[PDB]
Design a protein around this nucleic acid. Structure first.
Ligand SMILES: [Mg+2]
Ligand SMILES: [Mg+2]
Ligand SMILES: [Mg+2]
Ligand SMILES: [Mg+2]
Ligand SMILES: [Mg+2]
Ligand SMILES: [Mg+2]
Ligand SMILES: [Mg+2]
Ligand SMILES: [Mg+2]
Ligand SMILES: [Mg+2]
Ligand SMILES: [Mg+2]
Ligand SMILES: [Mg+2]
Ligand SMILES: [Mg+2]
Ligand SMILES: [Mg+2]
Ligand code: NA
Ligand code: NA
Ligand code: NA
Lengths: 120, 210, 144, 53, 63, 144, 107, 50
RNA sequence: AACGUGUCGCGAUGGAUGACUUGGCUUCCUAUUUCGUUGAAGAACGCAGCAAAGUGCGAUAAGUGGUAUCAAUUGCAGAAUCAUUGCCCAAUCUUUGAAC
RNA sequence: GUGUAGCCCUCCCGAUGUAGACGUGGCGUGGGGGUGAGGACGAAGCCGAUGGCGCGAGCCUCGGAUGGACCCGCCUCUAG
RNA sequence: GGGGUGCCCCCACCCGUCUUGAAACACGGACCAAGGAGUCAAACAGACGCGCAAGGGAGGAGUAUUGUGACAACUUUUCUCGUACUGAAAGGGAGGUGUGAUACACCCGUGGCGUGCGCAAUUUGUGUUUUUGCCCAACACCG
RNA sequence: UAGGGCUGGUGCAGGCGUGGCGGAAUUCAAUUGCAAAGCAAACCCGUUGCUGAACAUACAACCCUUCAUGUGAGUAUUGAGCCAAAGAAGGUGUCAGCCCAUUACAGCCACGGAGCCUACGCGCCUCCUCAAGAGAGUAGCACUGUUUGGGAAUGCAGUGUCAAGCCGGCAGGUAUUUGUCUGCCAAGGUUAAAUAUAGAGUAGGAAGACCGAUAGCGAACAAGUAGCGUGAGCGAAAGUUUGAAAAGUACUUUGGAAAGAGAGUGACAUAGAACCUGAAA
């Protein structure tokens, strides 16, 4: 419920959100196969999940989520990285709305969420 | 150069304006549409809570004073003790069933008294008076399913049972009487006016005559 | 209803058909033979009107006749003319409804004839230049 | 009007608009002054002056 | 007026009238109230502060 | 609106219509109605001759409600009746009854020509109003 | 400062009456900027079955049937971000005005 | 004059009415402009400096 | 001749303008609405693995306890429902200060 | 058809000016209501032996080996 | 045709201000950017625009409404200005013609005179009628 | 007989409160400079027809030749769809109803110790209930002072004097004495609602024809801070706005270092770290 007729108020609420709010704001759509199975449009992303990037320089790349850097509003994906001058490898952040979820790390709490959001 | 202007008399030399050194003395009305909405909301809320009692209690009809408003009628504060006795209602019990009571009014003429007595009698015949105990009804009270037919009144003036104010009807066309076409009404009225105006002077003349 | 004189007084200063760029007052009214912003030329508020335009390689003459002035769908007619039509017959087709536009009708009919001829020549020349040069791409709109 | 107390539609100032039709009417045209002949357009060969020479 | 031009052009059989202007309140204030033979109404804000006794008034007539 | 003021016309004139010699200063003649008997005497005497001085008796606690007495003339009595009633009654017929207190009037003055006879109820009446209404076929009934 | 204004009651009713009559002339309607080429019989009056619609899809079909969809499309294409400081003050988008629909009540 | 009523589902005429005579009234665009200018001032909110 | 002057291309110095805005100012509304000897408001000194200011806290000292949610916090370490996050019932609460 | 890129064509008479008054379909700036457009094939801003138009306030095109995201024409309302 | 730079012959006292009089041996004046001064309210008057008109207009309140909703719509007035003035006050309070010396009778009407747009009727341009608005001088009526 | 939940004890119940959960539809099809672009002049024709003055790969600075190197991210354009009781305005590497979060009850869950509301909510025990008089250092009066529109004295204060109630006292806007009439009954106390919040708080909300970094609060920043004064007090400047992302320049060479010359990242380094644009003097 961040969006408001007040632009000044809506932007303050977004950029000063606490950690538990930022978890919901960082959500990604499910793939077509997952949608046909669980009947859920989208879910919040978490570590050890598999995603495919859809927008940006890395298009079509797949990998496993390594970190959810909520302080920078980005997620880290393995095999999505850049080289430094010294040769060191560093991860590159990608916004969660530019990806899609292909595999979910199932859990008894995560299963409860899917049954909550099941539209059927 | 001033010319032909009125002398102003504007009356504004008393530090009413808020500035860097003065708090000021002002009153604005920016909350007028908001306060109108709030008052309406409270009236609807009160009606829901006190249902099915009428919104406003019964009031009497009175005459306005002075010669400017002699012919006008309005609503008074409460009913007179003489009026309540004439309709056979005790004053302390009357306040219980929604009748305003005024212990200061005087009832100086029968015309005003008779109008207000009729107001109470009509209100009494229209009351339904839900019983205090539904299992044991005492005294003439509402019967069963007469309670279920009650309805709140929201007339803003409490005129659901009594109605509006009573004023004499306008006269109808007629013919001029033979004496009306002869009598000099200014001579009639001036003679009476002079009797009071020159009461002191005429007495002084007779006393000097002795 | 109301008259042309009253309606012109209402819209003369401001209208969506009035273009006042660079101090020049012209008109974008579709039923204006020349773009002059005047009461006589403005055919949208006139009871009867006629304008001359082109439809491919033929002269197209739309008329109002002012009998269905409350039904926008039936206000105008199309009346496609024959190929190689003389400007005198177009001049006589107009002036049966607006005799005060007969001389403007002849000049417009001649200008439309010349533009049709030029479009054929310009397109023919442009196609010849495009025949020899090679192009990196070509877009075809899908059917159905 | 019943909803608005005492309101009526205002009366027109003109019983008929289209003053152009009135100007171009037989009755109005019957009282207009007749047209007069105008001089010829000044040709080339500017007209003389100077009276004496 | 568009009916008049229709039936009576050139104004045959007409009577032209104007309407009064001398009774207006603004006209009553023209002039100075304090000069002899004036009869001009002053611009008064406080009616009770400009009463004046019957004597001490200006002369009502002048040639 | 600020765009219609003289300030917009005076941008660049340096004096705003107040002159170079006698400038725009603050109160060169005093504040308010100052000096009305010393250096503004001619203005006061010419336009407000009755300003200075006293006149008449006093009246504490006026109570304006006791002197309420609106007046109406015999010439305006038709405005208090129905339109049909004005021509319906004459001389020996049944006449309409007008009550002045309901309409907000106290005294009946007699000025002008009376139109139709009627019966008028009033608190006060005049000498002339009484005579004129009686001759026309009406009467006055005193009220309180 | 004097923010509000009073207007004579009769003058306000005169203005409404004049605006209603102006909406009855197709020449004045086109001159204001509305697209009414496919409409028939201005002023347009439709049956009362419109009040019983429940789905927005049904409403859109009705607008296309009577030819009022062109004015709706004109408003849709004109939506854009407002120029100037106004976009910082809670008015970020501007759009044009389309058709009216008048109903006997709020039902 | 007469006004026709069109159906909401197909290109058809289903009724007939009369002009309500409010559309015949004079058009005073100078009055409309004056009333609109002053009516549009009544939604304003106040502003001021401290 | 050098110095000095003028026009043009390029480069310095300086921080204007435009576009941005989690700030101000102004108006309106709603409450189970109003501190303290059961020690307030203010003032001082301390507390983190690396921690100057600011923020939170008080020797239980960037927090103990209850509750809902679940995988983070992140500059580098380091640990792996129990943390973090939001809210709140149970607690701790250094030296002073009406200070008794 | 007062006033504009003046509806058009002939003819006659005046044209300087401090303080001051008045007029102008006179110029320009920030914002509101309408209407019509423009922009990553490059918006605002900035630069100029870039010219054209207007008595003038000014407007517009051109080039940038400048910039990198918004902005304007017309009718009206408003002002720090 | 426009633009830039130089040259020749000719012309040409430093801007703003107070002042009778400034190029002044009268005052303020090194350069650039951004700021910088007739505004808001209230009482009255005149000109001009708009609505209604012997009447005009409210205000405060109330009635019906997440909707362009602090808007918009709705409510013989209940108040105010005006249709009547005059006197310190008690108080009084204005039509015309005719006939007589709260008088009597009528009611399609400018109190009379002069100068008076336009219209009407005559003579061949003049004279005449009704005169609107305005102004002048004499009545009459009200306090 | 009846009642009192506001006599007291003991229990059973709604709602006010707090914390959570739940809503549709494209990352659809065509690019990596130039066709991911247009034309068919109101509406239909058009679910259809026709293409190219940037390619005989153009542009890149006095002219010609060779050899080179150069276009960030589709929320842009075009064509097809779909949702709408939702078109709502925030985020996302460019302008987004269908990428994300939001948008609702025409709702669903757990918690709830005091309080407030509901046949004055509902049982049981206990208790409870159904001729006189009327305010004394008071009111009044005198003098003095102040206050008021209150004028031979509107309210109050000080001192002096100081009542009536057997035809009482106070008020009735010009002083005194006398007689009527009208309205009230001082000198003890409590009391909701409609009203204020003109430099206050505690939690929430709603906005704006307002200002836009010399403006708006002094303070958009570790601001009542740094600094100044013995003290009472006074009181700033300053947008970290590089970039989508630090990818924040490895390495070679000269130099004591700072740095320079090359190399490299990035669409752009004349975006290189008080780093958008970058004017005038
Ligand atoms: Mg003078
Ligand atoms: Mg101060
Ligand atoms: Mg001058
Ligand atoms: Mg002046
Ligand atoms: Mg002077
Ligand atoms: Mg001149
Ligand atoms: Mg501004
Ligand atoms: Mg001197
Ligand atoms: Mg000088
Ligand atoms: Mg000298
Ligand atoms: Mg008390
Ligand atoms: Mg500041
Ligand atoms: Mg400051
Ligand atoms: Na701008
Ligand atoms: Na000096
Ligand atoms: Na005493």
């Amino acid at each position: 419920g961040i969006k408001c007729r007040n632009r000044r108020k809506a932007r303050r609420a977004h950029f000063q959100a606490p950690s538990h709010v930022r978890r919901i704001l960082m959500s990604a759509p499910l793939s077509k196969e997952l949608r046909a199975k669980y009947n859920v449009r989208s879910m919040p992303v978490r570590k050890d999940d598999e995603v495919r990037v859809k927008r940006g320089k890395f298009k079509g790349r797949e990998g496993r989520v390594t970190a959810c850097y909520r302080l920078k509003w980005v997620i880290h994906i393995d095999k999505v990285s850049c080289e430094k001058a010294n040769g060191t490898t560093v991860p590159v952040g990608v916004h969660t709305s530019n990806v899609e979820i292909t595999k979910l790390k199932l859990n008894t709490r995560r299963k409860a969420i899917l049954e909550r959001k099941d539209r059927s | 150069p001033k010319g032909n202007n009125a002398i102003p008399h504007v009356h504004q030399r008393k530090h009413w304006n808020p500035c860097s050194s003065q708090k000021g003395n002002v009153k604005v009305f920016f909350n007028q549409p908001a306060q109108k909405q709030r008052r309406r909301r409270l009236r609807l809320l009160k009606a829901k809570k006190i249902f099915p009692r009428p919104l406003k209690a019964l009031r009497p009809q009175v005459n306005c004073p002075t010669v400017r408003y002699n012919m006008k009628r309005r609503l008074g504060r409460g009913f007179s003790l003489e009026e309540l006795k004439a309709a056979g209602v005790k004053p302390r019990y009357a306040r219980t069933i929604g009748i305003r009571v005024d212990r200061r009014r005087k009832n100086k003429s029968e015309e005003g008294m008779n109008i207000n007595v009729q107001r109470l009698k009509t209100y009494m015949s229209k009351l339904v008076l839900f019983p205090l105990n539904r299992k044991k009804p005492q005294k003439g009270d509402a019967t069963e399913e007469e309670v279920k037919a009650a309805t709140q009144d929201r007339s803003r003036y409490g005129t659901a049972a009594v109605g509006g104010l009573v004023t004499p009807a306008r006269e109808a066309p007629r013919k001029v009487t033979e004496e009306e076409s002869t009598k000099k009404m200014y001579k009639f009225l001036k003679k009476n006016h002079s009797a009071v105006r020159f009461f002191r002077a005429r007495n002084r003349r007779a006393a000097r005559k002795e | 209803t109301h008259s042309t004189d009253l309606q012109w007084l209402l819209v003369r200063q401001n209208s969506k058909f009035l273009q006042k760029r660079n101090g020049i007052r012209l008109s974008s009214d579709p039923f204006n033979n020349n773009a002059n912003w005047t009461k006589r030329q403005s055919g949208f508020l006139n009871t009867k009107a006629a304008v001359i335009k082109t439809k491919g390689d033929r002269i197209l003459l739309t008329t109002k006749s002012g009998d269905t002035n409350n039904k926008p769908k039936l206000m105008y007619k199309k009346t496609v003319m024959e190929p190689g039509v003389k400007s005198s017959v177009v001049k006589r087709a107009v002036a049966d409804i607006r005799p005060d536009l007969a001389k403007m009708a002849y000049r417009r009919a001649r200008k439309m004839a010349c533009t049709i001829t030029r479009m054929k020549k310009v397109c023919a020349a442009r196609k010849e230049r495009s025949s020899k040069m090679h192009f990196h791409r070509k877009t075809v709109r899908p059917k159905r | 009007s019943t909803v608005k107390s005492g309101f009526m539609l205002p009366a027109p100032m003109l019983t008929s608009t289209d003053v152009t039709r009135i100007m171009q009417s037989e009755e109005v045209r019957r009282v207009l002054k007749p047209k007069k002949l105008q001089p010829k357009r000044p040709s080339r060969y500017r007209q003389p002056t100077n009276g004496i020479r | 007026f568009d009916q008049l031009a229709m039936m009576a052009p050139t104004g045959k059989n007409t009577m032209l009238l104007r309407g009064r202007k001398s009774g207006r309140e603004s006209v009553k204030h023209f002039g100075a109230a304090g000069v002899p033979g004036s009869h001009a109404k002053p611009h008064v804000s406080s009616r009770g502060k400009e009463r004046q006794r019957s004597s001490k008034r200006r002369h009502a007539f002048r040639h | 609106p600020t765009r219609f003021k003289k300030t917009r016309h005076q941008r660049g004139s340096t004096f705003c219509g107040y002159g170079r010699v006698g400038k725009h200063r603050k109160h060169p003649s005093g504040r308010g109605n100052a000096g009305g008997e010393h250096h503004h005497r001619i203005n006061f005497r010419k336009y407000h001759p009755g300003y200075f001085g006293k006149c008449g008796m006093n009246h504490y606690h006026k109570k304006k409600n006791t002197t309420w007495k609106p007046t109406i003339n015999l010439d305006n009595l038709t405005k208090l009746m129905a339109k049909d009633e004005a021509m319906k009654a004459k001389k020996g017929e049944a006449l309409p009854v007008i009550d002045l207190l309901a309409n907000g009037y106290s005294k009946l003055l007699g000025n002008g020509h009376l139109q139709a006879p009627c019966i008028v109820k009033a608190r006060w009446v005049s000498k002339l109003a009484d005579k004129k209404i009686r001759k026309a076929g009406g009467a006055v009934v005193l009220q309180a | 400062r004097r923010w509000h204004r009073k207007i004579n009651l009769h003058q306000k009713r005169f203005a409404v009456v004049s605006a209603l009559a102006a909406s009855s002339l197709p020449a004045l309607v086109m001159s204001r900027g509305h697209k009414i080429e496919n409409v028939a019989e201005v002023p347009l009056v439709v049956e009362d079955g419109v009040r019983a619609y429940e789905k927005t899809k049904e409403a859109m079909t009705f607008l296309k049937t009577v030819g009022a969809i062109d004015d709706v499309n004109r408003v849709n294409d004109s939506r854009q971000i407002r120029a100037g400081r106004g976009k910082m003050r809670n008015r970020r988008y501007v759009a044009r005005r389309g058709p009216m629909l008048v109903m006997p009540d709020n039902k | 004059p007469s006004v026709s009523v069109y159906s909401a589902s197909e290109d058809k005429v289903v009724g007939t009415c009369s002009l309500p005579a409010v559309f015949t009234a004079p058009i005073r665009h100078d009055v409309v402009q004056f009333v609109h200018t002053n009516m549009a001032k009544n939604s304003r909110q106040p502003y001021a400096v401290n």
